[PDB]
């Protein structure tokens, strides 16, 4: 009887300026794994099998990497 | 009887300026693993199988890495 | 009867300026593991299988790494 | 009958300027492990299987690492 | 009958300037482990299986490491 849940129940001269804002938001990620089988053999690389939630407002810079999941970087400068 | 939950129940001359704001927010990540089997063999790399939640407002800089999950960096400068 | 929960119940001339703000916030991460089996063999790399919650307002600097989960860095300068 | 919970119940001329703020905040991380089995063999690397909560307002500096979970650094300068 | 809980119940011309602030705060981390089995063999690396909560307002410095959980540093300068 497995379950994952994210709920927002709401049973029942104002001025808003630049308010009630959502910028770079992750909301409500539900994940279930039941009776799964994984075998990972990794030599020198990247393996991601889980849950990744990234929320960013601002990332700035030349040659930057903002969000990287399962990433191999082998550059030659 | 496994369960993960994140709930926001709300049973029942204002001025907002730049208020009630969400910038770089992760909210409500529910994850269940029941009767799973994992085998990981890792030689010199990166393996991520869990839950990763990253919330950032601002990341600044040349050649920066803001959020990295399962990341191999082998550069030559 | 396993359970993880994060709840915000609320049964029942103001001026806001830059207030009630959320910047770089992780909120409500619920995780359940029941009757799981993990085998990890790691030689010289990185393995992450748990729960990681990172909340940052500001990270600044050239060549910086803000949030890194399961990360192998083998650069040559 | 295992349970982890984080609850905020609230049964029942003001001026806010830059107030009621959340900057770099982790809030409400609930985790349950029941009848799990882990085997870790680690030679010279990093393995993280637990719960990590990091909350930072400001991290500044070139070549800095703000939040690192399961991290192998073998650079050559 | 295992349980971990963190609760904030609240049954029932002001001026705020830069007040009621949360900067670099970890709040409400509940963790339960029941009938788990762990075997760790570690040779020369880092293994973290527990609960880590880090809350920092400011970390400053070139080449600094603010928060490190399960970290192997073997640099050559």
UniProtKB/Swiss-Prot annotation, chains A, B, C, D, E:
Phosphorylated, predominantly on serine residues. Phosphorylation by CK1 appears to occur on residues distinct from the residue phosphorylated by other kinases. Hallmark lesions of neurodegenerative synucleinopathies contain alpha-synuclein that is modified by nitration of tyrosine residues and possibly by dityrosine cross-linking to generated stable oligomers. It comes from the Eukaryota. Residues 7-44 are annotated as: 4 X 11 AA tandem repeats of [EGS]-K-T-K-[EQ]-[GQ]-V-X(4). One of its GO terms (cellular component) is membrane. The keyword Secreted applies. Sequence repeats lie at residues 19-33, 34-44. Its main location: cytoplasm. Keywords: Acetylation, Alzheimer disease, Amyloid, Cell projection, Copper, Cytoplasm, Disease variant, Membrane, Metal-binding, Neurodegeneration, Nucleus, Parkinson disease, Parkinsonism, Phosphoprotein, Repeat, Secreted, Synapse, Ubl conjugation. The modification Phosphoserine is found at residue 64. The keyword Metal-binding applies. Cu cation binds at residue 27. Changing residue 27 to A: Impairs copper-binding. It is found in: Cytoplasm; Membrane; Nucleus; Synapse. The 'non A-beta component of Alzheimer disease amyloid plaque' domain (NAC domain) is involved in fibrils formation. The middle hydrophobic region forms the core of the filaments. The C-terminus may regulate aggregation and determine the diameter of the filaments. Neuronal protein that plays several roles in synaptic activity such as regulation of synaptic vesicle trafficking and subsequent neurotransmitter release. Participates as a monomer in synaptic vesicle exocytosis by enhancing vesicle priming, fusion and dilation of exocytotic fusion pores. Mechanistically, acts by increasing local Ca(2+) release from microdomains which is essential for the enhancement of ATP-induced exocytosis. Soluble monomer. Homotetramer. A dynamic intracellular population of tetramers and monomers coexists normally and the tetramer plays an essential role in maintaining homeostasis. Interacts with UCHL1. Interacts with phospholipase D and histones. Interacts (via N-terminus) with synphilin-1/SNCAIP; this interaction promotes formation of SNCA inclusions in the cytoplasm. Interacts with CALM1. Interacts with STXBP1; this interaction controls SNCA self-replicating aggregation. Interacts with SNARE components VAMP2 and SNAP25; these interactions allows SNARE complex assembly and integrity. Belongs to the synuclein family. It is linked to Genetic alterations of SNCA resulting in aberrant polymerization into fibrils, are associated with several neurodegenerative diseases (synucleinopathies). SNCA fibrillar aggregates represent the major non A-beta component of Alzheimer disease amyloid plaque, and a major component of Lewy body inclusions. They are also found within Lewy body (LB)-like intraneuronal inclusions, glial inclusions and axonal spheroids in neurodegeneration with brain iron accumulation type 1. Parkinson disease 1, autosomal dominant: A complex neurodegenerative disorder characterized by bradykinesia, resting tremor, muscular rigidity and postural instability. Additional features are characteristic postural abnormalities, dysautonomia, dystonic cramps, and dementia. The pathology of Parkinson disease involves the loss of dopaminergic neurons in the substantia nigra and the presence of Lewy bodies (intraneuronal accumulations of aggregated proteins), in surviving neurons in various areas of the brain. This is Alpha-synuclein. It comes from Homo sapiens. The chain holds residues 14 to 100 of 140 of the full protein.
